[PDB]
Design a protein around this ligand. Structure first.
Ligand SMILES: CCn1ncc(C(=O)N(C)[C@H]2C[C@@H](c3cccc(C(F)(F)F)c3)C2)c1-c1ccccc1
Length: 180
């Protein structure tokens, strides 16, 4: 069920730099000047996969090597794009995140701390639509389960969700890379 993900530049916050092949994204030093369109996330450095999931099983892996912060998973296509919101399962985002170098958490509401013995350099994301399951795997630790969201009971199409961090004038400029 391994799927070739590509990043949708129409969704990408101006703080983001996408590679030419749209297989990579990183935080930029400054905001790019880019057309204001309704699909674009305007308040946080977030971008979606081009791919839409209506059903079935879907798997992809991401390199997070050298990063102090990131967020990965899946969201409803219907999520609001403009203004401020909370990354939570209750808001249509099924994600895990790193921040402050070592704080791993699942984006439940309220959030669930994760205790990772081996810090992941690559993360696997498995979506099972009919099961209502989004699962996260520690590829560095031989595929151990990081976290699973269960009985999410999805209605509409879902999208891959990425953020290579938030802008804090910090050093978190290494890219997220989609693994071949
Ligand atoms: C979307 C708002 N939001 N929802 C929940 C949380 C939250 O509690 N904080 C602790 C963690 C930081 C994690 C993170 C890691 C990498 C990239 C991003 C982002 F937002 F850019 F996509 C976010 C999410 C926040 C948040 C709070 C402060 C600053 C920015 C966001």
């Amino acid at each position: 069920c391994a799927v070739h993900i590509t990043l949708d530049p129409d969704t990408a916050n101006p703080w983001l730099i996408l590679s030419e092949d749209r297989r990579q994204v990183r935080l930029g030093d400054t905001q790019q000047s880019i057309p204001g369109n309704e699909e674009r996330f305007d308040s946080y450095p977030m971008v979606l996969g081009a791919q839409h999931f209506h059903s079935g099983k879907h798997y992809w892996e991401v390199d997070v090597t050298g990063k102090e912060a990131w967020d990965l998973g899946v969201c409803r296509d219907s999520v609001r794009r403009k203004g401020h919101f909370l990354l939570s399962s209750k808001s249509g985002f099924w994600t895990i995140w790193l921040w402050n170098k070592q704080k791993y958490e699942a984006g439940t509401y309220p959030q669930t701390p994760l205790h990772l013995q081996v810090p992941p350099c690559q993360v696997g994301i498995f979506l099972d639509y009919e099961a209502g399951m989004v699962s996260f795997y520690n590829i560095t630790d031989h595929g151990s389960l990081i976290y699973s969201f269960s009985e999410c009971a999805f209605t509409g199409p879902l999208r891959p969700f990425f953020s290579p961090g938030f802008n804090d004038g910090g050093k978190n400029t290494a890219p997220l890379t989609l693994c071949p």
